[model samples]
Target: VEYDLKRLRNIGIAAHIDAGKTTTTERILYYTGRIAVTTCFWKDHRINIIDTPGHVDFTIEVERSMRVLDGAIVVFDSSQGVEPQSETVWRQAEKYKVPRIAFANKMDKTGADLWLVIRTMQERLGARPVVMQLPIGREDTFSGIIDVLRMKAYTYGNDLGTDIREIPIPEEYLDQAREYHEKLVEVAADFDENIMLKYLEGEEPTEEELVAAIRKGTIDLKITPVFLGSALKNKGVQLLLDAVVDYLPSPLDIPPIKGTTPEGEVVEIHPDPNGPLAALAFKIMADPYVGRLTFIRVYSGTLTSGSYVYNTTKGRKERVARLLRMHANHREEVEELKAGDLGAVVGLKETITGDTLVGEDAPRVILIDVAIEPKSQALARLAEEDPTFRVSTHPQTIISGMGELHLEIIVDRLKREFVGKPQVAYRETITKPVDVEGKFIRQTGGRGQYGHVKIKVEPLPRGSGFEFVNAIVGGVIPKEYIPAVQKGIEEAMQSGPLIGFPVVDIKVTLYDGSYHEVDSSEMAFKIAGSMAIKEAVQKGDPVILEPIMRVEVTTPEEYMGDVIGDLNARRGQILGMEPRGNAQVIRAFVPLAEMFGYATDLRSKTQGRGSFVMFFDHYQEVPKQVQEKLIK
Candidate 1:
């Protein structure tokens, strides 16, 4: 699998759910001849696209994509201006260091303003967008765009591969183009010394020099060039493709990968065809038919079918049985993949996301950070749809797990109905202190089962998770069954006796326990250990706690009052607030439970003028009023 890095462009289409990333992607593929013809934005397109949800809920997936992409096309709704999800994606891009081009789409719609869109980028996202193209008109008058770099105007038609006519810039758009062109020149001037000096001297810059400068600036992330058009109307899309070719970065433009060797030696993965094989597994998919498919972006060297590669993250090795080039849902088998290329391989059972793939004998380990931890979690007990459990409670338990599956299924099924849905599950643990005692005494026909144990529970620092230590030295209870005692305690903690939340951060020691070895099995001793914890929980004043997330709300100054009131209503504590350009950033901490519908609510209260982001902060005890309802 020898791939040519220079010819590769690993780009993703990203935006808020409805910002038209998919539509723009469809158009680009069609114009690039990657697809046979133009397709509908959402419903009809068959192109390979990793369409990510725009809302914060799907931030993890978007973040994962950013980690592997060489560049991205950021689509912004021309009518709606900047969106909350846009800020989140921008943050992720910064985290992944992905360069991007800003596409001001939907200009044909009423209220579409390219300048306003660009202004939003500069203010909200701290972006410097150069104007590569200007729309011909506003609203319905928006039919095409003038490519400033080529000094040509292009009008798109319904037919695929249709030749666009070169014409003079419309008088209506001439002044605007000049205004944008001047800014474009100014932005390009900052990147190239010659252009800067020439512009200062009032000398003209050639089209090639200006384009090269703009392209370099874009790849360097100094500025993002804005292309204006309506993806829906198929206007100015082909011109954007030309810009993709002219401006978007090839793999060679990025720096070599930096890593440390297994022996604590520093190393770099230069983008060279003959270099040592090095790649990163940025995404993983578990398929029912294929088991698991690991997606990798080769940063250096080459990977071929049947070759062995080292999984530095897992500290294991795997054979590359098959390699594939993927487009959304379609995949093409490829023989070899080289530096600066992206591909997937199946049959590596132990490989996982974020693993680094290197040579068979290499001892170096390379690790990349995951975009975001899953915000929620629920126990998934796999059982047959029809089981022996007849109790209604059993059905309810199944329903809880089904609810999580339902969210994923519905959002994926109704993808076009919405940009994306929020993540509905999270990983959490108990937050309160619990103490319980256990005694198991059974007299059977012949022998007997006798086991007794006591346990205590308390919260551990966040991320400390779970720990178990055996402090029993004098052997008040037999030493052989100590592990059994610990196992029982752990099993009891799985689903707390009260409202089901994971039990964590508690040390259960076998301080004292009595076991009859002749009659006691692991199960009997386990039951005793379990009983002690449950009894202790009742006495220790067990209380429920939920994860609290640090949230930042950004809204127009006029909407600050409404935003604050809304946060308070959700039991959110305001940490602080400050002005950020045209908006106010409100920092606060709120329980995750109160945040379920915050995105929609924030948009409603601010009249769609507000946005926010949240990350895990800490776990706090539930309020008295909330606990009463939840306990039952």
Candidate 2:
């Protein structure tokens, strides 16, 4: 149970179907101290692999793994350069901002060109590949790799057939090794100041320092380091294995994950064996021997066998009846597993994929906003005066500025013209179908307002918007009057009778209506249409939905805990968290009403380093409150 956080690598192995990852990973498993399986122990550190196939459909699964995957080994096809689906994996890995190392597998195959994909990876994916290892030969004669970083060679006519160790750089390939040797130092200057100054003189830095500079760039999520080997032949994997431990970051290097409490509290959960127990069941499968196997990665604290754990997501208690370390078909019954370890658990009754299970752990906003609009030509000129000041209108005219103070000045200047009330952008929709009749009548009027209409109001699926159907066959209403009826319904939708917000997601059918030839003008028909919906909505059980904003906060690691809690206090629902360089990317969904002062809040939360952008995503049913508001 004492797996040090510094020595653990939670990584994924992925490539297109042509990259032959299974062969590479299988060879890696065979070479390491562990069995020829997924998780391998190399150079005293543990390397656990989450293998993904190259199929495009598997991207859905790969995206799920990316949530917890720390680093990735992206295998590129050297024979064909970057394949169609190879770009798919690279983009998927990039989307998650996962630190990546490129491997050109299948170098032993015909038409192998180690030089092919690097340029393609550069132009296509915008990647900067720093060559850490160079192949000794190409195709059939491809026997070994020279460590460009170390300036040494290990060949294998007997490669992997006997002891795989470093030897003198071959005379033939020695000149080629210097090609990248100088390139490695040149790239090192971009990341490290000391290395640049050291290289400015006629001196080169030590090999250890070169590794340090490249490792920083790798973990920075830039500058992908490239390694080449034939996984099927297994010559260069041993060196590749050592490089994984040497450069790729351990679990401790990753920032803490945000653990949310049931009452919307944010807790920073780090990888610490002595901390409170928290583990997420990322994958679940049915095993014939174990009935159901729940694969879990412990994010914090240790989980002992036979310990009762609390599942925060489901609010249920599960007993960790057994802990099994899986190695292909072999299973080792373990007493306990520590933080940063991947293992399987038995007797998890309610555990499933994406369910966060913890051991009894993990476990707010005020704002002033107003509808903005220009009062006169003077206010319009004021908007033109400043770039930060903006004015817009649709349902309501709004004016915005850099800050509340900035707006306050504009509001003061505009006090000479106009002002409006603050309102939430809520919507109304119906729950039941109801038919209603509307009639407009007048006495002793030549152009009498004589119109009658029947409309069926039906609830539509959310986000369906408003649809008007003309089922009035046979000229029950004339073609001219028909559009007037639709026009009335359209205008009436701008505000519903309940709390005055615009109604949406409903269909209106003008099935039957009558009109007098002389008296039934478009005006009468329009009034009838509006009147019909008012009654239809009263009887159809209207509900209110508030607009939701998809908020993404990018803040430094120092402010991650604060940012998450700040989002929670705003009643923001935590979507997920990701790491970008030294920053933590927080995604959440919050009601637009709660996000009024969000800019100021986010600025203070992260000391102005935090930034966020949001757009209206959809409408959600409010948690139920408040009814006094004017519609017009």
Candidate 3:
């Protein structure tokens, strides 16, 4: 069936780990009839949903998912309220300008306080939460929700809570539901000028008018309509789906998808099936069955199977061997995909995540960062599959990831496929200025090398990186050779004089240099520059720098003392602690060197009850004692 672009809903589910985001998406697919080869229709509207990973280590999944979605359902653990990763994903949605609705899930679990979750969203995420539904019962007894907009209660029946029955509001919840319903209408009215005028005049808007205003506020991101449900218990899911169609925006409602031409001209592609084809490959997966699958979101025009599309980002053409609509892992072949549709394409060898697929006539590239033997080819392929995984060779094969666990997984993958004991990546920089002269004079050579350079080295502010200034005068060193000097200095900075670690936040000035016109070539000048920088670095006060990580550990109050003490022993600086449920969250800044086996240590300390998430914070000078050990 042909669906209007205005009726299509492209949305994603995002939340913190264990917040029931995946469970909600599973229920959404089941109720929508997409899970069991069943075609569920919601008023003839097509809804496309992406289930994003909530783990901070896999945050890139949520980030790119938000980039293509028009709206999002941010799931929250009603018990825990706003979590760390919830705040992270919320910020990601805000960055992409994606409007959102809040789902307070896990209401069946103990300590499920919907009101507290709403307040947390307001205070932590800084977003208005418009209560559209209220729970009818507390914890374990939570079998349904009272729809404030419709003033009706929906309770799940048998068939695994799939059958929902609409009934009158229970006498116990009637007053509370009515009160929240009035508040919802009042807040939603503020989004519409006419509705606000009528509301101020003491005119109660009809349920339809209130719904319209709520939709307007939601689409405009003025307010987030909150829905309550226990996704695991299959309670209040159908209503949530209805709310998605009613409140979330379709592709036509969002701003046009933007890109740039080869000539660097900016352009916008409207959501029109008849316009030139423009789609974004947001995700790439290594599908065992299909070899590789690139998930594309169509912003305009139509893409048909067997057609060739240009990979604008890579500046190459790729054939669309086949097109398939993805329902999680399952897929069904489709002949064509229209504007505002999400589908996967097969047989695109060069296309990776974040690449744009456009019609040949309207070629436009969307830039995305990329990485590199027999062993090199495998590593390169792995990096291609996952953007967060990076590999580089600067005298050493260095692999990096989002976090320790992320790197662990990458290491595990490497071991299975083809790997490292893993070592802490350290850096070095100078603390003082020193002048050094380098002279390269060789005799008995066909072209005797005669290059001399005098350079002053000084430390710059942290994170300033490397800088080079040419202070030579009177053509002592030809202008053309200055770049060669800078290049040589840069190469030397890659491997510092102390500990052979990469140097940063340093500057060098070439004040005087003498060159023999017959022998002073780029090579000679480059070699002289390298020699001078190395000599200066050794003379200057050089120090080692280690990476610090921001760590948050959630543990029971009883284990707080032990956790704090252990962190102190590891040279951790305790930032603060706050209460979350029966547990306390301890924040700290710890060196990565000390956190290598922290996961195993934490589990053993708390009997597996403690958990933590850490990310790179900044680089700081290593303590003298620690530096001695590292050097030794």
Candidate 4:
């Protein structure tokens, strides 16, 4: 395994009964045929998707699901549209800022209208629902879908999930298809950068759709692209599944958890195997084989089998005897759990649902802003017994596992109250090898401290995270103090000399150091390590690296000339373009910096109709001029 985290998706389904959600999921299950509530596979991607209860009484189930999953599929009945409970669960998903895509199922049923459903979503839920496909026939006669982006028609025959083909769009629907496809491009551009910028010239519709803009816009909460399908008839399950992977966000796409240390400080705990452990116990139930099962979503750090974890919610310690991976039929045992993993553990006694688990040695608490006032007596009195839970008035406390979108929605409950802001995540790395020495000496008469260390630093290939080598021979620096030196370098690497971003893909070697055995302590050696990295970075010629996104833009022949020229102006590398349907499928790689407003710009150039999808491809060294602009 390359240990890459990009291929995993944690998603859930939210729908009202009789809407065909069950059949939708079943078809998805059969098509994938590989494997959820257990693990499953679709196109080499592992998706852990579960069914979320829709009733208000099962609100807790929704919360646990929303908090743990990265994305969701909100299934609506094309015949009936949004219901009361559907709105409720949606509100919960909003609170967690879980990105989602919608499926208009049961298109074969009577009274089904994609327009009515989309209008209801906007009026009832206050959403920006963009139609991604068009229904080919009226209810009962519904046979297939016309992909607005692809400018092609897909119709299913009376036969079961056997074979279907993509042919030219039927002349009868081309006019409406153009309107829908045009709006989709405009809507996508409003959310994506590359597309907004890539649209430099035209008034003609791009015949085929690209994933770049639709994908980026969907995850950013800028728009909700709806797919029309008849899951019960197995008409568009495979297409819907394709859209799930293309539009929904992966665990790696969301933000890290923001928490407070026990003392008082903010920390962004990212998904990493080596970081301090931070997990949330979202579900607790009894299992026949492994009784007292506790399900957890690891937000950051790793959880090892047979280790004790502290319940930050209860301030109690709980033991993890074993961990299990879930499947539809049975469970499998695992030795460890990684960040972003959704798995089960056994033998947890006092950790209840909603409790936070963290490394006992390094304590931190979820900053959930919850202000509660109870008759002001018993609530305050009960809080005295256990100081762990707090009761307050006003906005002093905060909620946990939140994003800006999540927090903004919370304000709406108060906005009766208030208001709310992507750039590329650029990293720093060294280009050359340089050696430097760090000396920490405080010879203030008694017990003078003296620690000196020499270290060398060099850049490593991409994805090769920080590596530290100890080349010391003579016990001059002493093995006891070597770890302290490494720790110091690690701390310094957290932020680099430029813009303070974490230095990445670099190797550091400690070869020499002199220490006064009597006075040199761990603290002194740690300081020496810090001093070496801080100074070595300057001599090593550090440079900034920006994320490169793999982007695709499908434009009509008339606009291709203008769009291609515009993209090139942003220093984008044109990959290739081929005739796809009625438009040209243009593939390119552009720095994230150039993508921010491309969607809107692309819309204007293409007469307000165009679409694309993009994701992080790799980090590359920024060409000279852009690097200089960032330094200041």
Best by the TM-score measure? 1
1-632 per-residue lDDT for model 2 (tens digits) = 34667888878787755577677776777777542115657777877876563454333356667766687888888887776456656666766777889888888789788878787777655678888888887788887788887788887766454556678887898787888888889898999888988878847898878898889989987689898888777678777777788788787777777756656667677788888778877666667897777878888788899887877656677889998887644687888988877788977675566677777543310002231223256666564334445665445556742333346667766656445434455678888999899999975445467879999999989878788898888798888778888888888887787876678889998898888877778788888889999889978778777766677777656668978887887778989978654346788897767777677687677565566666557777765453222232
- The candidate scoring highest on lDDT is 3
| Candidate 1 per-residue lDDT over residues 7-54, each given as its tens digit | 456677777657887777766755554430111121122222343444
Least well predicted 10-residue stretch by lDDT in candidate 3: 367-376
- Residues 1-632 of candidate 3 have per-residue lDDT tens digits of 67777788888787765887777877877777742111235656777776565564344565677777787888899987886557656656765678889899988789899988988887666678888888877888886678888899888774277478889998988799879877876896677677776668877777777887789888888788888888878887788888888889988888886677667777678878888888988777777898788888888888999998888777788899998877645577889989888788887786778787888875455631111001165677676676665667667666755665466666667777764545667788888988898888876467677778999889888778777887877899998878888888888888888799778888888899798878778777888888998888878878998877788886666678899989988789998988653356799998878887787798788765566777677888987899999889
Query: Scored by CA lDDT, what does every candidate get?
Result: 0.66, 0.73, 0.77, 0.73
Q: How many clashes in each candidate?
A: 23, 6, 2, 33
TM match of model 4 to true structure: 0.55
Which 10-residue window of candidate 4 scores lowest in summed lDDT? Answer: 368-377
TM-score comparison, 1 vs 3, better candidate: 1
RMSD to truth, every model: 7.4, 18.7, 8.0, 19.0
- Candidate 3 TM-score versus the reference: 0.70
Once superposed on the true structure, which residue ranges of model 2 sit more than 4 Å away at CA?
Answer: 33-37, 58-60, 158-160, 163-165, 262-267, 361-632
Predict model 2's lDDT versus the native: 0.73
Question: Candidate 3: lDDT over CA atoms?
Answer: 0.77
